[PDB]
């Protein structure tokens, strides 16, 4: 059973082995799993239920393997779309920013963000 | 109409305009006879006059005088004098509204402001009054459950809320009658409904018997027993 | 910088990606003035 | 006179209820995106619950309460003020952090000792993971939040859609992650701060809710009180009416009286 | 009954409503009707109550209805203003306070000596959209000792009668009440006059307290109205408001005080009417009738 | 033209403007001008239908526009007051509803016996603050069938002509209602009678729905806007009504609403002259002519 939700959308919230990008790594929970509590980095996710995939762009939040095999994954922004150019230009604004300026930590994200979304 | 009911014997009807006019008429020659106007400009010899007028027409042996008179309320302050001297004489009310005219419902009379003060159990017959009465709690329901009940949503009804609803719309519609003065006026022939088949046909309706059946196969219906064949080729 | 705020910027980042929605737009921009307040005064109003 | 005087009262009640009535209205409409916004957010708070419960949840303090900017929906400024005070009475000298100012400015009156940090400019949106976001972020700075070793969270819960019970829950604090025994139920290394960041990211997602709850609550609470106030204003239609219209003839006999006497002469 | 200003037409379906209840051969109708001159109305409730007069001064204890003063005011406006006398206040000529006062005054609870001679005058007041200020009205009620407003907006909400009690006053009432209705009453006016305030409120925190006296006043409400052209008995009125009172009653469900009173009713004239007997005939409630009472009131409770 | 009351320098004006739009070839002013007598400007709409009679007699049609009945009433009053006949309300003469009727009724469409003529009239009652409820204009209301009512809000938000449609019914109306005209103009009526209802919402968080109409009266609202002093051909009435009734205006941005319907006035005229000629000399619209029409109208919207 998977819990996958936003707050303004609820999506797997069964499900047969869900691929996540973790602070201990990569991890996939493919039915028992032992039961964790992952904070999820900025990540391209990936969720299949059967030989079914579904591919979604996230912007990190928690994971947590619930004892009662209920995998509840907590995110901002999670899907195909959301991945699917202005980002880089974006970057090169960002990356002159942190020259002045949080604002570094920000462009940071977004070097990150940039990687993850060319991963795709 | 005196000649018709004392002289032929016949029961009339007499039908009478506005009645404000006759205020106002009456009031006029008040005026010109220079006496002094009574309050909110009216005859001082206004009740007296109409008194006359409206105690003419009256149910003799021989006959009787019904009268339909045509009130046009002035400012429609019903406060106001005149009216207040019409209301002494009338008996019933039937209260026509566009509104219900705009329901689609031709007679057009308001139900729910159609009053009579002869709707007494004892004079209409006590079967007559409790299926009357019924009726009439029925719209009251249905007009006050329609309101939040439109506004929420139909589902929010209970199963005896949607059963008014659903006895009342087919009131509603079976209302509708059309008439057959106007068979030209809508192109529909008309229907004449006596008054013994009224009270049989709402006890029916009251007890949902007929009541699985369109409301459009009540609309614009006759009696009873004629929309059960309207219901008939409704479904054909 | 708070791990929800990073996680909050990573957020609003991801949506610059050409596909857009006005509630996303939304949940991209928001102002408000958070305000202290003493044991009293008010330090000045200061934009969150 | 007092035949313009209650013509430009009655006018102004009418223009009232018309007011009342475009409110109501657009209340609803309003009530609608609140309404599923709540749904989506208590989804993702339930989530959250689901590690607090199976972990064992067991547990000066803070408290934190929202209640808009803008006011005129109905009493839920006011109930959940008064059931803030009540808990105020509980704690010794916690700090109230009041999102929005019309709790705010209730809750000053009551003590503006305990006051100490306060936002504005929340209401008029409907709440967003951003602004949450920000409200923590500057909760942990400012309040320094781990120094209370329990917080709890005041808000409105939308009972039922015509109800509004203030609310109030606890936000478990990183003290409470490290003595549940969630070790023994979940599994984590140590390289993660799991409590400095589950502490962080529950801080932000329980708030986030309270407010979907509390935003749903103000609508609704508007919708309800707006409609009464229709129905007060239409019974002082009814009122002025009969008021206007008995004014109304009686300056039409006063001023025939006086004429009638010029003529009488 | 004097009957002034009313449909002749009107007028002989009560003779007949009358002689239906066979009522007749114990009272005089004078009538003056729409149709009658306007100069005959106005002399209609003087010449009335020389009538009555004449049973008051045999000692005799009588009653007269003057239905309606508002239509011999207009009778007097039209009379007044043909005369051409200058139009009064509210185009109701300046002696109508005269014409009334000089009416009404002629009712009267005489003296020993006079062998007290009744005639009780109840006059009928058409208030003009219900407007208790207004100057025929108002002159009538400064006249007259107690007034017994009656309400639009509970007529229409079946409360028939519909006594409004805000507006329903006697102010030398609780004299005439007989021993047994004044220990029954327990000052239900005030009880309702907390209904009133209750109801007010209803419309805040609703107490426990104030959902009781509303519990309370809504059941009491429910009991008051009666069927019109169905009077009953004194007798029968003692244990009602017994009932009421002593909060027995208070406790039914709304939908069954219909058949709580009728039954109460049939209940107690089955069980023993001979309580209601004693009380008829004694007029007071004894403690041990009061007790009696209880006990009976009890037993249809359970039941 | 039937000048009351009127100041001779206004009329000269008025003259004038009849002179420039060169329309006294077929006009006649009958005036009776302020300084003119009292007596005067009584008789002066009684002469006036005189005048129209002629021309109706001879089976012709007219209009005698009677401007303004209000003050041809304080003549009346002059002369009554002054011939101390009874004074009656609001110091206006007891048969001034006679005076007003007696002058309202000499104006008819005619049997064929009698050629079939008519005298068209259209009266002007000058409303002191709008109310309408005043002696003068109540009498008038009841006398005539049909009203127009202009109203100074709208004269302010500059819908000129100004006329407030809510206060406006003809009781004939419709009947001679030419048909091109009438079949699209159902439409507009309702459409009309939605944006009042959804007036209020003009102030945030709007249904989809309510915007839709919101929309409609907008863009509607724009296009009964005309230029005092430049009336408009039937022929292009019918055009401009169809689009709107089609919904094809809606999109234009509702500045461009007044560029747009002279271009579209000109674009029919250069573009579909067979049309308007049509719609013209037919008097009616052919499935034909309405598809060709919807065309134009497309064509035009595009560009």
Same mark, same amino acid.
């Given at each position: 059973?998977?819990?996958?939700?936003?707050?303004?959308?609820?999506?797997?919230?069964?499900?047969?082995?869900?691929?996540?990008?973790?602070?201990? &790594?990569?991890? &996939?929970?493919?039915?028992?799993?032992?039961?964790?509590?992952?904070?999820?980095?900025?990540?391209?996710?990936?969720?299949?239920?059967?030989?079914?995939?579904?591919?979604?762009?996230?912007? &990190? &939040?928690?994971?947590?393997?619930?004892?009662?095999?209920?995998?509840?994954?907590?995110?901002?922004?999670?899907?195909?779309?959301?991945?699917?150019?202005?980002?880089?230009?974006?970057?090169?604004?960002?990356?002159?920013?942190?020259?002045?300026?949080?604002?570094?930590?920000?462009?940071?994200?977004?070097?990150?963000?940039?990687?993850?979304?060319?991963?795709? | 109409?005196?000649?018709?009911?004392?002289?032929?014997?016949?029961?009339?009807?007499?039908? %009478?305009?506005?009645?404000?006019?006759?205020?106002?008429?009456?009031?006029?020659?008040?005026?010109?006879?220079?006496?002094?106007?009574?309050?909110?400009?009216?005859?001082?010899?206004?009740?007296?006059?109409?008194?006359?007028?409206?105690?003419? %027409?009256?149910?003799?042996?021989?006959?009787?005088?019904?009268?339909?008179?045509?009130?046009?309320?002035?400012?429609?302050?019903?406060?106001?004098?005149?009216?207040?001297?019409?209301?002494?004489?009338?008996?019933?009310?039937?209260?026509?509204?566009?509104?219900?005219?705009?329901?689609? %419902?031709?007679?057009?009379?308001?139900?729910?402001?159609?009053?009579?003060?002869?709707?007494?159990?004892?004079?209409?017959?006590?079967?007559?009054?409790?299926?009357?009465?019924?009726?009439?709690?029925?719209?009251?329901?249905?007009?006050?459950?329609?309101?939040?009940?439109?506004?929420?949503?139909?589902?929010?009804?209970?199963?005896?809320?949607?059963?008014?609803?659903?006895?009342?719309?087919?009131?509603?519609?079976?209302?509708?009658?059309?008439?057959?003065?106007?068979?030209?006026?809508?192109?529909?022939?008309?229907?004449?409904?006596?008054?013994?088949?009224?009270?049989?046909?709402?006890?029916?309706?009251?007890?949902?018997?007929?009541?699985?059946?369109?409301?459009?196969?009540?609309?614009?219906?006759?009696?009873?027993?004629?929309?059960?064949?309207?219901?008939?080729?409704?479904?054909? | 910088?708070?791990?929800?705020?990073?996680?909050?910027?990573?957020?609003?980042?991801?949506?610059?990606?050409?596909?857009?929605?006005?509630?996303?737009?939304?949940?991209?921009?928001?102002?408000?003035?958070?305000?202290?307040?003493?044991?009293?005064?008010?330090?000045?109003?200061?934009?969150? | 006179?007092?035949?313009?005087?209650?013509?430009?009262?009655?006018?102004?009640?009418?223009?009232?209820?018309?007011?009342?009535?475009?409110?109501?209205?657009?209340?609803?409409?309003?009530?609608?995106?609140?309404?599923?916004?709540?749904?989506?957010?208590?989804?993702?708070?339930?989530?959250?619950?689901?590690?607090?419960?199976?972990?064992?949840?067991?547990?000066?303090?803070?408290?934190?309460?929202?209640?808009?900017?803008?006011?005129?929906?109905?009493?839920?400024?006011?109930?959940?003020?008064?059931?803030?005070?009540?808990?105020?009475?509980?704690?010794?000298?916690?700090?109230?952090?009041?999102?929005?100012?019309?709790?705010?400015?209730?809750?000053?009156?009551?003590?503006?000792?305990?006051?100490?940090?306060?936002?504005?400019?929340?209401?008029?949106?409907?709440?967003?993971?951003?602004?949450?976001?920000?409200?923590?972020?500057?909760?942990?700075?400012?309040?320094?939040?781990?120094?209370?070793?329990?917080?709890?969270?005041?808000?409105?819960?939308?009972?039922?859609?015509?109800?509004?019970?203030?609310?109030?829950?606890?936000?478990?604090?990183?003290?409470?992650?490290?003595?549940?025994?969630?070790?023994?139920?979940?599994?984590?290394?140590?390289?993660?701060?799991?409590?400095?960041?589950?502490?962080?990211?529950?801080?932000?997602?329980?708030?986030?809710?309270?407010?979907?709850?509390?935003?749903?609550?103000?609508?609704?609470?508007?919708?309800?009180?707006?409609?009464?106030?229709?129905?007060?204003?239409?019974?002082?239609?009814?009122?002025?009416?009969?008021?206007?219209?008995?004014?109304?003839?009686?300056?039409?006999?006063?001023?025939?009286?006086?004429?009638?006497?010029?003529?009488?002469? | 009954?004097?009957?002034?200003?009313?449909?002749?037409?009107?007028?002989?379906?009560?003779?007949?409503?009358?002689?239906?209840?066979?009522?007749?051969?114990?009272?005089?109708?004078?009538?003056?009707?729409?149709?009658?001159?306007?100069?005959?109305?106005?002399?209609?409730?003087?010449?009335?109550?020389?009538?009555?007069?004449?049973?008051?001064?045999?000692?005799?204890?009588?009653?007269?209805?003057?239905?309606?003063?508002?239509?011999?005011?207009?009778? #007097?406006?039209?009379?007044?203003?043909?005369?051409?006398?200058?139009?009064?206040?509210?185009?109701?000529?300046?002696?109508?306070? #005269?014409?009334?006062?000089?009416?009404?005054?002629?009712?009267?609870?005489? @003296?020993?000596?006079?062998?007290?001679? @009744?005639?009780?005058?109840?006059?009928?007041?058409?208030?003009?959209?219900?407007?208790?200020?207004?100057?025929?009205?108002?002159?009538?009620?400064?006249?007259?000792?107690?007034?017994?407003?009656?309400?639009?907006?509970?007529?229409?909400?079946?409360?028939?009668?519909?006594?409004?009690?805000?507006? @329903?006053?006697?102010?030398?009432?609780?004299?005439?009440?007989?021993?047994?209705?004044?220990?029954?009453?327990?000052?239900?006016?005030?009880?309702?006059?907390?209904?009133?305030?209750?109801?007010?409120?209803?419309?805040?925190?609703?107490?426990?307290? *104030?959902?009781?006296?509303?519990?309370?006043?809504?059941?009491? *409400?429910?009991?008051?109205?009666?069927?019109? #052209?169905?009077?009953?008995?004194?007798?029968?009125?003692?244990?009602?408001?017994?009932?009421?009172?002593?909060?027995?009653?208070?406790?039914?469900?709304?939908?069954?005080?219909?058949?709580?009173?009728?039954?109460?009713?049939?209940?107690?004239? @089955?069980?023993?009417?001979?309580?209601? *007997?004693?009380?008829?005939?004694?007029?007071?409630?004894?403690?041990?009738?009061?007790?009696?009472?209880?006990?009976?009131?009890?037993?249809?409770?359970?039941?």
């Amino acid at each position: 059973k998977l819990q996958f939700a936003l707050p303004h959308e609820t999506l797997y919230s069964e499900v047969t082995q869900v691929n996540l990008p973790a602070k201990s &790594g990569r991890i &996939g929970v493919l039915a028992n799993h032992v039961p964790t509590v992952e904070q999820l980095l900025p990540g391209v996710v990936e969720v299949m239920e059967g030989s079914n995939s579904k591919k979604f762009f996230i912007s &990190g &939040g928690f994971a947590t393997v619930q004892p009662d095999s209920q995998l509840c994954v907590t995110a901002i922004e999670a899907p195909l779309e959301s991945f699917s150019e202005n980002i880089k230009n974006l970057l090169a604004e960002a990356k002159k920013n942190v020259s002045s300026s949080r604002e570094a930590a920000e462009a940071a994200i977004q070097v990150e963000v940039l990687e993850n979304l060319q991963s795709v | 109409a005196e000649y018709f009911r004392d002289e032929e014997g016949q029961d009339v009807l007499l039908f %009478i305009d506005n009645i404000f006019r006759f205020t106002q008429a009456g009031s006029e020659v008040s005026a010109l006879l220079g006496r002094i106007p009574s309050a909110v400009g009216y005859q001082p010899t206004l009740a007296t006059d109409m008194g006359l007028l409206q105690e003419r %027409i009256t149910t003799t042996k021989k006959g009787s005088v019904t009268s339909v008179q045509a009130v046009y309320v002035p400012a429609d302050d019903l406060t106001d004098p005149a009216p207040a001297t019409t209301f002494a004489h009338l008996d019933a009310t039937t209260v026509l509204s566009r509104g219900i005219s705009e329901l689609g %419902i031709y007679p057009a009379v308001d139900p729910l402001d159609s009053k009579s003060r002869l709707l007494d159990a004892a004079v209409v017959g006590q079967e007559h009054y409790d299926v009357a009465s019924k009726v009439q709690e029925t719209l009251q329901t249905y007009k006050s459950l329609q309101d939040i009940i439109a506004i929420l949503g139909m589902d929010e009804l209970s199963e005896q809320d949607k059963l008014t609803v659903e006895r009342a719309r087919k009131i509603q519609r079976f209302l509708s009658q059309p008439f057959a003065v106007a068979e030209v006026f809508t192109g529909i022939p008309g229907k004449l409904v006596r008054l013994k088949d009224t009270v049989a046909s709402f006890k029916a309706v009251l007890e949902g018997k007929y009541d699985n059946i369109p409301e459009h196969a009540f609309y614009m219906v006759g009696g009873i027993e004629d929309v059960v064949a309207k219901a008939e080729k409704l479904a054909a | 910088i708070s791990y929800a705020a990073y996680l909050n910027v990573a957020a609003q980042a991801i949506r610059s990606t050409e596909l857009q929605t006005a509630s996303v737009l939304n949940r991209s921009q928001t102002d408000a003035f958070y305000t202290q307040y003493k044991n009293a005064s008010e330090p000045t109003p200061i934009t969150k | 006179a007092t035949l313009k005087e209650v013509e430009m009262r009655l006018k102004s009640i009418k223009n009232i209820e018309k007011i009342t009535k475009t409110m109501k209205i657009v209340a609803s409409t309003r009530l609608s995106k609140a309404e599923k916004a709540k749904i989506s957010a208590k989804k993702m708070d339930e989530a959250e619950q689901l590690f607090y419960k199976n972990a064992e949840t067991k547990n000066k303090e803070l408290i934190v309460a929202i209640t808009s900017d803008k006011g005129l929906c109905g009493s839920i400024h006011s109930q959940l003020a008064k059931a803030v005070r009540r808990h105020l009475n509980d704690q010794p000298n916690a700090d109230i952090v009041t999102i929005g100012d019309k709790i705010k400015m209730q809750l000053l009156r009551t003590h503006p000792n305990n006051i100490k940090l306060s936002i504005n400019g929340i209401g008029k949106d409907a709440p967003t993971f951003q602004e949450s976001a920000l409200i923590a972020d500057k909760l942990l700075s400012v309040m320094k939040a781990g120094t209370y070793p329990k917080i709890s969270i005041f808000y409105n819960d939308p009972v039922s859609s015509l109800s509004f019970e203030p609310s109030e829950k606890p936000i478990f604090n990183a003290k409470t992650i490290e003595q549940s025994p969630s070790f023994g139920k979940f599994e984590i290394d140590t390289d993660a701060n799991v409590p400095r960041d589950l502490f962080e990211y529950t801080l932000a997602n329980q708030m986030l809710t309270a407010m979907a709850q509390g935003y749903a609550a103000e609508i609704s609470a508007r919708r309800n009180a707006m409609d009464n106030a229709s129905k007060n204003a239409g019974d002082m239609i009814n009122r002025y009416s009969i008021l206007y219209n008995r004014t109304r003839q009686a300056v039409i006999t006063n001023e025939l009286v006086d004429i009638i006497t010029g003529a009488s002469s | 009954y004097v009957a002034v200003g009313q449909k002749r037409s009107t007028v002989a379906q009560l003779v007949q409503t009358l002689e239906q209840h066979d009522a007749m051969k114990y009272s005089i109708i004078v009538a003056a009707t729409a149709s009658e001159a306007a100069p005959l109305q106005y002399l209609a409730p003087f010449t009335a109550a020389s009538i009555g007069e004449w049973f008051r001064d045999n000692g005799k204890h009588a009653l007269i209805v003057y239905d309606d003063l508002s239509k011999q005011a207009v009778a #007097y406006r039209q009379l007044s203003l043909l005369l051409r006398r200058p139009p009064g206040r509210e185009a109701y000529p300046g002696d109508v306070f #005269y014409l009334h006062s000089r009416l009404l005054e002629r009712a009267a609870k005489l @003296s020993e000596k006079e062998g007290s001679g @009744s005639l009780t005058a109840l006059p009928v007041i058409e208030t003009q959209g219900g407007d208790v200020s207004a100057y025929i009205p108002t002159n009538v009620i400064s006249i007259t000792d107690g007034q017994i407003f009656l309400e639009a907006e509970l007529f229409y909400k079946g409360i028939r009668p519909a006594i409004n009690v805000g507006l @329903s006053v006697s102010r030398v009432g609780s004299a005439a009440q007989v021993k047994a209705l004044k220990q029954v009453a327990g000052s239900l006016k005030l009880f309702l006059a907390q209904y009133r305030e209750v109801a007010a409120f209803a419309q805040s925190d609703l107490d426990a307290s *104030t959902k009781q006296t509303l519990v309370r006043g809504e059941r009491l *409400t429910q009991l008051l109205k009666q069927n019109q #052209y169905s009077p009953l008995a004194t007798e029968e009125q003692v244990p009602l408001i017994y009932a009421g009172v002593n909060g027995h009653l208070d406790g039914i469900e709304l939908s069954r005080i219909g058949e709580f009173e009728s039954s109460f009713l049939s209940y107690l004239k @089955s069980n023993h009417n001979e309580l209601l *007997t004693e009380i008829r005939e004694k007029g007071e409630l004894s403690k041990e009738l009061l007790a009696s009472l209880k006990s009976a009131t009890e037993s249809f409770v359970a039941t």
